[PDB]
């Protein structure tokens, strides 16, 4: 019983199905006084909601669906016609982003591709896209710099699209900002966004020397 199937469970038990909010408000409930879990939560979701109605995106792209928390915040805003995709390379969460969208009653806004950003995003073509109006980078951090300059080189970005990259202070994504920053192809503004808690995994490795 993973805490991804948690998660899910409590939505399906507390939250008003086909309403998107309550369903936002039943993961945050949870994630805040349960256990900790890694969506973007409201207050980031402030602003995800401000941009997305600000820049009033056609089509979306997501690269890290994990549970369907940022999907759901995304799709509920979207106009009639408009499309978001969310790229997702865990199978495990993209069937729990599925049932969350489903339970929202956004799974016609929304189509999950499995499989890595690096290896679906030259494939975009083949689902019907030109360009893209937005996208929300949420997923590995050693990935912002490397996709981005892809989907310049996939011919996805037009004139105004919209980069929302998430977790750029903390962890860090220093390379990303220093590209996107210090290009002129990039104009960019920063959003503070205080956080009480984040858990990430890391590591340390152990190497015994042998010999030369
Ligand atoms: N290269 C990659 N391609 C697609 N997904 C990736 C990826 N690297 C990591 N991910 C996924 O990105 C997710 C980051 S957590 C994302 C949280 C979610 N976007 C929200 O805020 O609601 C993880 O579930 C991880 O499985
Ligand atoms: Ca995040």
Redesign the pocket.
């Known amino acids: 019983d993973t805490k991804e199937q948690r998660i899910l469970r409590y939505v399906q038990q507390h939250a008003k199905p086909g309403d998107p909010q309550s369903v936002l408000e039943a993961?945050d409930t949870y994630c805040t006084q349960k256990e900790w879990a890694?969506?973007?939560?409201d207050a980031?979701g402030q602003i995800m909601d401000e941009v997305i109605q600000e820049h009033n995106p056609s089509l979306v792209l997501?690269?890290?669906?994990?549970?369907?928390?940022?999907?759901?915040?995304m799709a509920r805003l979207l106009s009639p016609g408009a499309r978001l995709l969310?790229?997702?390379?865990?199978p495990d969460?993209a069937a729990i982003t599925q049932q969350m969208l489903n339970f929202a009653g956004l799974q016609d806004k929304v189509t999950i591709l499995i499989?890595?950003?690096?290896?679906?995003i030259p494939q975009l073509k083949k689902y019907d896209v030109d360009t893209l109006d937005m996208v929300?980078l949420?997923?590995?951090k050693?990935?912002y710099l490397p996709?981005t300059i892809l989907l310049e080189e996939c011919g996805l970005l037009r004139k105004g699209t919209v980069l929302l990259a998430?977790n750029v202070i903390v962890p860090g994504t220093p390379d990303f900002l220093a590209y996107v920053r210090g290009s002129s192809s990039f104009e960019c503004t920063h959003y503070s966004s205080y956080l009480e808690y984040m858990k990430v995994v890391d590591g340390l490795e152990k190497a015994v020397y042998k010999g030369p």
């Open positions: 993961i890694m969506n973007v939560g980031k997501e690269l890290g669906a994990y549970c369907g928390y940022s999907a759901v915040r969310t790229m997702e390379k865990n969460y499989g890595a950003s690096q290896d679906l929300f949420d997923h590995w050693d990935r996709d998430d």
